[PDB]
């Protein structure tokens, strides 16, 4: 907690996520495995998410 009221909150997770693969070129296949996260219970009128740094440097 910074004096101005800014909070930093980090946690360590192991995430297992669905990566729907299309195995037509197997085993010469490339895939794009997604990782989608957002707010349960809060719509875009209440909670929005943004990347902390430039999007290309935020993961």
């Amino acid at each position, epitope marked *: 907690i910074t004096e*101005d009221g*800014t909070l930093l909150y980090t946690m360590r997770l192991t995430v297992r996520a669905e990566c729907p693969m299309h195995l037509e070129d197997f085993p010469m296949d490339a895939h794009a495995c997604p990782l989608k996260f957002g707010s349960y219970a809060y719509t875009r009128a209440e909670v*929005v998410y*943004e*990347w902390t740094r*430039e*999007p*290309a*440097r935020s993961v």
Partner: antibody
Amino acid sequence: VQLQQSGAELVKPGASVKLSCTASGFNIKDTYMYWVKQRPEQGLEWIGRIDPANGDTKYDPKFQGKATITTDTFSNTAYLQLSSLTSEDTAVYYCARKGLRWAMDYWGQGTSVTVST
Amino acid sequence: NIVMTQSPKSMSMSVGERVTLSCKASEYVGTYVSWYQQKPEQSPKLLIYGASNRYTGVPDRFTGSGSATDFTLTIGSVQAEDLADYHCGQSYSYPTFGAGTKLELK
């Protein structure tokens, strides 16, 4: 919400300049700050940005060394300082803040830097 | 560096007709593409942020459309107060802007 830039400046070639941008309506700590130059009838060129929360700054490679950006949390101002400038950078300079989707939602009015003798 | 190519460089047109401005991205820039309007001797004004998100105060006739590397700004019922430079800028990486499109009345 309101960015107030310094006035226009005439500068001798080879000298130094210090442009200012006073933010009203928000804390500069809460966003990133951007300096953007624009030559007459030409595209926008990005100079660099600063994070007032930490002071971490990034510069366009062609402005590395030549430009430096600093902040002042107390006065809510961002400063662009041009160490050694030739006649080529006789362009307007814009102060902008980061917006919703990393867009630049609020720009300053622009400080006209003209250089001659 | 992500270079953004803006087409056409300049285009003249008449009032009240659909005009579309295209921007091309060198690399992937997901939807962090913005469209700015610059009237003469005025600072740029954000029109579209993200891909297809009108900024507050932008008339509903300004429509943004996007992709991974291809974006367009479409003006619908054009008016006479739309004569301005239009710049596209990416924000996926450190920001870069295109040359711009100088709208003309004809």
